[PDB]
């Protein structure tokens, strides 16, 4: 089962990274009514708002994140998208460790660190979602949003499998 576990880990790590990178890049987080500015039905993301109806259909304008310390912090954290980006970064390093686990096998801790990166990536992702939704306060979420959500699920599955790999290693070599 070592092969299958590492396959799940590697494919999973790639899947999670891809989904999360697409999600951060693309602009189908939210379907609300609004204005792309040269109200109408729009599709927005982390960075841009874009129109789906009218003469300006496909025009896409940068979000003004800045139109109480708590409110300011929320606006800042939302504006930067630090948490979605940090999630992408940690998934990147997780996948890096997964790759490095094939070559330099001598140190077992590499695959564990992969695990910790993926688990942390998922926590960063949760915080991101909560900041996103909280800052937006009729609407609906689009496929970019759901890609972020599926990334969280896959990252947590891969974290669990990575940790299992390390456990199997430390339980094989001690005996």
């Amino acid at each position: 089962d070592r092969g299958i576990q590492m396959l799940i880990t590697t494919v999973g790590a790639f899947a999670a990274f891809s989904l999360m990178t697409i999600a951060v890049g693309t602009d189908y987080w939210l379907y609300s009514r609004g204005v792309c500015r040269t109200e109408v039905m729009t599709h927005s993301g982390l960075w841009r708002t874009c129109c789906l109806e009218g003469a300006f259909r496909g025009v896409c304008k940068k979000i003004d994140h800045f139109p109480d310390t708590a409110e300011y912090l929320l606006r800042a954290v939302r504006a930067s998208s630090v948490f979605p980006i940090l999630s992408v970064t940690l998934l990147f390093f997780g996948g890096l460790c997964v790759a490095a686990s094939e070559f330099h096998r001598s140190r077992h801790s590499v695959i564990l660190s992969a695990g910790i990166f993926f688990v942390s990536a998922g926590l960063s992702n949760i915080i991101g979602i909560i900041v996103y939704i909280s800052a937006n306060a009729s609407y609906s979420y689009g496929w970019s949003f759901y890609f972020g959500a599926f990334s969280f699920i896959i990252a947590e599955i891969v974290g669990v499998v990575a940790v299992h790999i390390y456990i199997e290693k430390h339980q094989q070599l001690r005996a």
Partner: protein, 111 residues
């Protein structure tokens, strides 16, 4: 302050939006276009106002100058995520702290 409802509404829609209309209207009336008694403009003006009313011009003008201004744009209800977000921040904070403590308690016991 006792004033006309139109002015009251317009004011309440603009910053520094610290004023508000209370209750209903004390009476019902309207503005008119005035002319000197015995003027020749009386009839045409009346007809012009009727034309403008029937063609939606007055409605559009009202909507433009009152609603679109919007300097400030502000019992079973579901709770919203914003109402409980703080509990989620504490939770993820706690998970972070737990992971940190676990790394320490490890490195300490590793040495």
């Amino acid at each position: 302050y006792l004033l006309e409802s139109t002015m009251n509404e317009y004011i309440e829609q603009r910053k520094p939006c610290d004023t508000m209309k209370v209750g209903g209207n004390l009476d019902s009336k309207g503005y008119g276009i005035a002319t000197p008694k015995g003027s020749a403009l009386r009839g045409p003006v009346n007809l012009a106002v009727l034309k403008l009313s029937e063609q939606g011009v007055l409605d559009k003008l009202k909507s433009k100058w009152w609603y679109d201004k919007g300097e400030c744009g502000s019992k079973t209800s579901a709770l919203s995520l914003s109402n409980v977000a703080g509990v989620f921040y504490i939770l993820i904070g706690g998970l972070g702290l737990a992971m940190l403590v676990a790394l320490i308690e490890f490195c300490y016991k590793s040495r």
